[PDB]
Amino acid sequence: MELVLKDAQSALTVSETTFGRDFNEALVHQVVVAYAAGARQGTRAQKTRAEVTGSGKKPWRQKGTGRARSGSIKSPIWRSGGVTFAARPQDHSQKVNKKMYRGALKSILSELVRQDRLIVVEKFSVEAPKTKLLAQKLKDMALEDVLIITGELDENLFLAARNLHKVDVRDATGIDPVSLIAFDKVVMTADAVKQVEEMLA
């Protein structure tokens, strides 16, 4: 298993199961849904018949009147107040096993090299935080919408990719499934591969 670079063709080898396992679609889908579910804020609340600002007085008599039987004006079948099963601020994040999360990331990375979307390079660093020269850089290697992942997160590259919409800079420990899927291409520097190999194992 060899990861060939773009220019110097220095042959880097990694573990077999990390970048060559079968693509378990069910395993990936659960983690992707769970990652989206954990980003849900879940800040919402309606009012029940016990929380609507109003009186607990019976509107009219139980019998005698020709009207329907009513006990409170806050009833959900009434106007100006209702909602029987009112929502509460809840948590939508769901638990993911360590081996399931790591197993899904290895299957995601294994499909990336099968779709030749993973481009490994020896180094990735800009001399100045200017976004013009960063936009000059990836255009020469014919990339427009990529995920810039490096082993060491430098502020010189963090500032240059802050304004460009289609690129994102992250730290090697801070990888997630959804950005490895949403972005078209993903680029590796040399030392990030050796750091993501051991964190997945």
């Binding site: 679609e25 990936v28 889908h29």
Partner: protein, 143 residues
Amino acid sequence: RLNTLSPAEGSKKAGKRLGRGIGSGLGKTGGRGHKGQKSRSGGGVRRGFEGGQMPLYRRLPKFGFTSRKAAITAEIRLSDLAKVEGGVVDLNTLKAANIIGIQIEFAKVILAGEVTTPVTVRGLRVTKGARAAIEAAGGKIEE
């Protein structure tokens, strides 16, 4: 690529939505039949209720008692006897590999098979069966 990930077959079931028309098959009291205590909202008998008849947990007599000595007593299988440390085993340091717990005061070594290494047992209570099995591996047993 993000719009092609599908779950496996049978992973989802979409739930049962009650009171949603004739065609859904779960309208008109929604799968709980006609009138009765079980049909009311919040209705339902308590656990063990037999309709006023004396329940099984009241027809039968109580028996036995809870011994606090059994709560600080555990059993050691031979599978997790060679896993812990070196070649010697005693009352402590078994909780260091988390096979008994800190509160355990008594322990026994039972015959569960798959014992290879010559472990030396000191202080535990091997029954008859692992005693010949531990000595078959070369390890000695003392107190």
